[PDB]
Design a binder for this molecule. Structure first.
Ligand code: ZN
Ligand code: ZN
Ligand code: ZN
Length: 121
RNA sequence: UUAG
């Protein structure tokens, strides 16, 4: 429901699974629900984990299967890129480059980077 | 250790 506000994105983005499994979903940032394990995000309200990647999952530059961390959902490290990008300490912390260049961002309300200060009224 |  409240996807248009950043506070809700923070609390809920890819916390839950997409109703529709067909390929109609662009299967990425455009859908606020998760489609696989590598897309999944533990809600930071239920699970307290650090911004840093779990090295049992992230080997170098590749995010791998989050299973194969023997810690499971109790791991105090991020298990997916989504978990990191939308971490309370990471989210909107850095200027969105696409917005700074073009004046528009394709990821829109699901960009994990900062856009421009909105006016209040 | 943010660039999907
Ligand atoms: Zn979906
Ligand atoms: Zn782990
Ligand atoms: Zn953006």
């Amino acid at each position: 429901p409240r996807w248009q506000e950043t506070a809700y994105v923070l609390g809920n983005y890819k916390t839950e699974p997409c109703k529709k499994p067909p390929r109609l979903c662009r299967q990425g940032y455009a859908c606020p629900y998760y489609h696989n394990s590598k897309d999944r995000r533990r809600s930071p309200r239920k699970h307290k984990y650090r911004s840093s990647p779990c090295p049992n999952v992230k080997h170098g530059d590749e995010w791998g299967d989050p299973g194969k961390c023997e810690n499971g959902d109790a791991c105090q490290y991020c298990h997916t890129r989504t978990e990191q990008q939308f971490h309370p300490e990471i989210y909107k912390s850095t200027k969105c480059n696409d917005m700074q260049q073009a004046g528009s961002c394709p990821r829109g309300p699901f960009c994990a980077f900062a856009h421009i200060e909105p006016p209040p009224l």
